[PDB]
Ligand binder design. Structure first.
Ligand SMILES: N[C@@H](Cc1ccc(O)cc1)C(=O)O
Ligand SMILES: N[C@@H](Cc1ccc(O)cc1)C(=O)O
Lengths: 266, 266
């Protein structure tokens, strides 16, 4: 005879990080809409992070991003076509540069979503990080209109908060879009509007930067007669509201008591 | 000191069945197109397997499906709305009945894909099984046209065989569609056309059966002013060509030497 209620061999049981879970859900939501996920580098060139996105130097708009500037010789930053890119190095302040890289390397129409680690020089508190994640979206092609951007986010909301969810758009500014907009989604349970992210129609100067860099690389122009929309949303804020995580600082804390709590979560 | 090239603890390493892999790829291909996967029961009623799909008794068309008829009291077959359905029981000869179940239980527009185990009374050889799998597709909604069906399969092909892949449609008969069609996809490597599955525009009588069963259940009609397309494709045939599996019989053989060979495969 054997006691069957006796503990068995202590085989280890793994788990996924909250951010990996939230990012996966977001990526799934958009895959169902035809978006494909691709990634960019965490260490970027000012050209891709700012200049190519219509964000000058000593431009008031630069202030919307507190940047970590890097230094050191011997580092090789490869451009979209594997080339050796140059320019002052920094930690990307957002995933947006990736939409420039992708466009020089591909041709419309397409739908991409690019999750990624981003960095801002900031003070770490209960709802603020210097190291966090964003999910960028970019859909370009003949006839793409703001009505489609709104449709996308409407689908994001429904997919995230159920049939009783709603979306709200208000004009807001971004050097890389025009019209520009901020969007919030209605969260029926918490009974409140959550400011989710920014978006808009890709700015004319962005398409121009893309086709200039293409020509400078021998590629033919590809974004002359197309339009598109782009959006960007913070992951931690969403992960927090979705898992009831009180301190944004727990994500990079590494505390098992914390991480372990998400083994169930799919 | 320790020999580091010495074998480590023999922790077990799992794996997925070839069919699970192929089905997963197919389901992913279509999820990117907005289709959602749902399943039906393996033991069906003649009503759902045949009658509701415009396939009479002692109808020549019945012969396109060699059926396993079942017997035994005490079995409860639940309909789409959980009700107690009746009718001669059988093993579903295809996943098609599931498109009737789904429609009585939902409202257009929608996109579904239903993978599933099916049964045909047949002799088991190198390329034939009595027990195999199918993947059904069903997209219904205002304005849905055959041009969309073709677009779907075009996307299936591209997704499965690359940019140099092509699709081919030819008229063929199915009591549940009109127009009816068979489609083949060009496989650039094997340099040949693969007859993949059947499809067409959902037959008027199918929508009628759906709305009659709905009314008989108190639900209001929902498929009066819509159209849709449906397709069905065999999985084993595809899995075989895709993994280079020579004998369709290996799938249900249970031989580890065989199964083990697909641990890598994603
Ligand atoms: N990249 C911006 C957010 C954003 C992203 C895409 C847009 O189209 C607009 C705004 C940020 O770091 O806050
Ligand atoms: N159900 C059919 C194949 C098929 C499926 C869907 C269709 O719309 C047409 C044909 C079979 O068992 O072979």
């Amino acid at each position: 005879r054997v006691d069957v209620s006796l503990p068995g061999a202590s085989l280890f049981s793994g788990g996924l990080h909250p951010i990996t879970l939230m990012e996966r859900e977001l990526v799934e939501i958009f895959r169902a809409l035809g978006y494909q996920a691709v990634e960019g580098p965490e260490v970027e060139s000012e050209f891709f992070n700012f200049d190519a996105l219509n964000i000058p130097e000593h431009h008031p708009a630069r202030d919307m991003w507190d940047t970590f500037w890097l230094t050191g010789e011997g580092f090789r930053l490869e451009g979209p076509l594997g080339e050796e890119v140059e320019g002052r190095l920094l930690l990307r302040t957002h995933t947006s540069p990736m939409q420039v890289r992708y466009m020089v390397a591909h041709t419309p129409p397409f739908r991409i979503v690019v999750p990624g680690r981003v960095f801002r020089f900031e003070q770490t508190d209960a709802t603020h990080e210097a190291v966090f994640h964003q999910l960028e979206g970019l859909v370009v092609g003949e006839g793409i209109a703001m009505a489609h951007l709104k449709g996308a986010i409407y689908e994001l909301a429904q997919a995230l908060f159920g049939p009783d969810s709603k979306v709200r758009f208000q004009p807001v500014y971004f050097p890389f879009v025009e019209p520009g907009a901020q969007f919030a989604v209605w969260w029926p349970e918490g009974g409140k509007w959550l400011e989710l992210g920014g978006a808009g129609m890709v700015h004319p100067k962005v398409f121009q930067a893309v086709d200039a860099y293409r020509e400078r690389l021998g590629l033919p122009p590809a974004y002359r007669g197309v339009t598109g929309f782009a959006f960007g949303l913070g992951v931690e804020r969403l992960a927090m509201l979705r898992y009831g995580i009180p301190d944004i600082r727990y994500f990079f804390g590494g505390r098992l008591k914390f991480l372990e709590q998400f083994k169930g979560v799919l």
